[PDB]
Amino acid sequence: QKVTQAQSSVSMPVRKAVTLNCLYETSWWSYYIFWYKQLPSKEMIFLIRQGSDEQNAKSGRYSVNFKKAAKSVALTISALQLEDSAKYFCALGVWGDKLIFGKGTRVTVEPRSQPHTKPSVFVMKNGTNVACLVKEFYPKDIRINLVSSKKITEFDPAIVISPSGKYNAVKLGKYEDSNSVTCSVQHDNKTVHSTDF
Template sequence: GDSVTQTEGLVTVTEGLPVKLNCTYQTTYLTIAFFWYVQYLNEAPQVLLRSSTDNKRTEHQGFHATLHKSSSSFHLQKSSAQLSDSALYYCALNQGGRALIFGTGTTVSVSP
């Protein structure tokens, strides 16, 4: 079936170092858009990045992701993690005529 896989449940990183969150997907439907959502503690999930174009880098708030349909991936990266980046991150995909499908989420913990 259709699915979004986030392999890491928890990623710990030291402030100032790079961080990468993996996201791969499997789908049999025409997929319209891919997203990364971030949820800070006791807050609502909010969109971080959105992409629908293959091999195009998308950036926002220092994070970037590139959709690679050849490898069914949409990994999230940041070159220098900040303490304020500590949060829960979801990868998601939107297929035509279907609701958004979320991955299992990756908690990022940034330490000083």
């Protein structure tokens, strides 16, 4: 009784149909295969059930491709949403007993294509701490730096997806010259300064 998910990480745009592969090795006549979703906060959520007796099942946007002879249970998610980005797990078990899980496959839903929007650069400060805020930009590729001569610590920038479909970003650091720290952003072959605003 083994479960294997060959794929490790899979990416796909919005409103498409992604497929996760699962292969099981079992000897039971009657059994069940469950597909669960795991969230970044480590929470398991039931998605689909497909036993060895029924035909292929679906529920909402979740469907299952079942082949007993080749022992294949492929999960299909149709019209992906931005909340689909999570780790999907395949499990095998009989009723009222344990589940045998695979290692899981991470699905990352990438935003639809957007027009190239220039970033907007702002700076906020508290003591030595200085953060640079970048409001609206597409594509996600972007470089950010803070003008300083006494940088105590720097941290990797955080890039997130805005509700508009473009990207937000925040870069935080500590500087001894914090009262005169500006921000520079290289995005879309263009340079934007915090002093521009």
